[PDB]
Design a protein around this ligand. Structure first.
Ligand SMILES: O=C(NCc1ccc(CNCc2ncc[nH]2)cc1)c1csc2nc[nH]c(=O)c12
Ligand SMILES: O=C(NCc1ccc(CNCc2ncc[nH]2)cc1)c1csc2nc[nH]c(=O)c12
Lengths: 205, 243
C-alpha cells in the first residue's frame, strides 16, 4: 500500500514510519508513506502558509496556493486511482466498517489541515472524501491521519462481539490478588465466556 | 500540565513534544511530557516484555514486572494527585465532554499497551480509568495517548496564545462548522458566496449559522437529537430543509 501525506509537520509521521507494526511494514516494503509540506511550496521570504477568511471572524485558513500545489505533487507521485482524503472534524466518523472500506485502496493521499481548515472550493476541486476520527477537538489533522494509517495498515497482507473476559499472567499472587483457580487447573470455554457476558451485562449495553 | 507516559515506543511522542501547538506548549513550559519504556525495566538478554496468559488461548499479555516497574517510576516522578489512565480498545469512548473532564487534571499518567493488553489485577491496583479514542482497531495505545494529549493540551492556559481559550471556543461546539473561504476570489472558476464579501456582519453570521445547521443535519443528524436550539436556529434549520 502507498500513502501520500500533505502536512505542515511531516516529521510527525516518523512516529508511524520508524516504529512498531507500521515501522516493520515500511522496513519490509509492504507500506510506503511519502510526505509533502505546503511550507516548501511558498514563494515569499516568510514562507506564509495561512490566509484570512472572507467574511471575517476569528481564525485563519490554510493558504490555498501552497496547499493546492503540495496536493498536486502528491497526486503526480501517486498516479492513477489515488483517493484523496481530507482529515476533517466535519467528516465521516471513523469506525471499523469505515476502516475496512478505506483499506480496499492501494493508494491514498491524506490531507492534513491546520488553523480553522481549508477553503470550501478546495474540497470540491481536490478532495474525494472527508473523515473524522471522533467527536473531540484536536489542533490539526496529523494525529487523525496517523490513526487512519495505523488502522488500514493492519489490512495489508504480511503486516500482521462482547467485552473481553479478564486475563491474567504471572505471578500467581500480585499485590495479594490471586488468579481465579479455574485458570491454572481444563476448558471450560466458560467461566471465560460467562465472565465475558457477566462483564458485558454489568458494564456496557 | 505534566503528563507521564508508559510506552514500548517512547520516541513516537516526539510527534507531540517537538511540533505544532503541543510543541510550542513544551518550549514555553506550559506542558511537560515524560516517557518511560517497560523494555528498559527488563532483566534478561532478550529484553522480554510479553508473557503467556494463564488458562491459555491465543495472544500474549504484557509482562507484569517490567510494566509495573515503569508505572512506578512515572508515579514517583509525578508526585501526589496523578490520575493513571490505561488506553484500551474497550475503555470509555473519548468525546469533547470526556476531554473537558480529563483536562481538569494537572497531572496524568498515560499507560499504552501492546499485545492483548495487561493483567486484570494491574487494572485494579495501578489504573484509575480506561479510555478508548474510537470504535476502530489500532496496533497499540500510543496514537490514542498522543490524541488524548493534543485534545487536553488545548485547555492549558496560554497554549492557544492570544486567541479565545478552549472554554470560550466551546460555546459553539454543538454543530458542525460552516464552509469557509480565503483567497483567491476565483478558484478554478468557482467564486466565494457574495454575502461573505458584503461586510454585513449579521447577514454573514445568519448565513454561516444556516450552513452549519444544514451540514449538521445532512452529515451528522444524530448530533441534533440531544441539542437545545434557539428560536433563530430552529427557524434557519427549517429554511435549509425547505430548500
Ligand atoms: O483537523 C482537525 N482538527 C482541527 C480543527 C478542529 C476544530 C475546528 C473547528 N473550530 C471551530 C469551532 N469552535 C467551536 C466549534 N467549532 C477546525 C479545525 C481534525 C481532522 S480529523 C479530526 N478528527 C477529530 N477531531 C479533529 O479535531 C479532527
Ligand atoms: O491498545 C489499543 N489497541 C490495541 C488492541 C486492539 C484490539 C485488541 C483486541 N484484540 C482482538 C484480537 N485478538 C487477536 C486478534 N484480534 C487488543 C488491543 C487501543 C487503545 S485505546 C484504543 N482506542 C481505539 N482503538 C484501539 O485499538 C485502541
Amino acid at each position: 500500500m502507498w500513502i501520500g501525506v500533505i502536512s505542515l509537520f511531516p516529521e510527525m509521521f516518523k512516529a508511524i514510519t520508524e516504529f512498531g507494526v507500521t515501522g516493520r511494514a515500511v522496513k519490509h516494503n509492504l507500506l510506503k508513506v511519502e510526505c509533502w509540506n505546503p511550507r516548501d511550496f511558498t514563494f515569499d521570504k516568510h514562507k506564509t502558509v495561512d490566509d484570512r477568511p472572507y467574511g471575517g471572524g476569528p481564525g485563519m485558513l490554510m493558504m490555498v496556493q501552497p496547499l493546492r500545489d503540495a496536493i498536486h505533487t502528491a497526486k503526480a507521485a501517486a498516479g492513477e486511482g489515488a483517493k484523496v482524503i481530507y482529515l476533517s472534524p466535519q467528516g465521516r466518523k471513523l469506525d471499523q466498517g469505515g476502516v475496512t472500506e478505506l483499506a480496499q485502496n492501494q493508494k491514498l493521499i491524506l490531507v492534513c489541515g491546520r488553523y480553522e481548515g481549508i477553503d470550501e472550493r478546495l474540497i470540491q476541486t481536490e478532495i474525494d472524501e472527508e473523515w473524522s476520527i471522533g467527536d473531540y477537538v484536536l489542533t490539526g489533522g496529523e494525529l487523525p491521519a496517523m490513526t487512519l494509517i495505523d488502522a488500514v495498515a493492519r489490512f495489508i497482507p504480511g503486516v500482521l462481539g462482547l467485552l473481553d473476559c479478564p486475563h491474567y499472567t504471572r505471578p500467581e499472587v500480585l499485590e495479594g490478588l490471586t488468579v481465579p483457580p479455574v485458570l491454572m487447573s481444563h476448558h471450560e470455554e466458560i467461566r471465560k465466556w460467562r465472565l465475558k457476558q457477566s462483564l458485558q451485562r454489568t458494564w456496557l449495553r
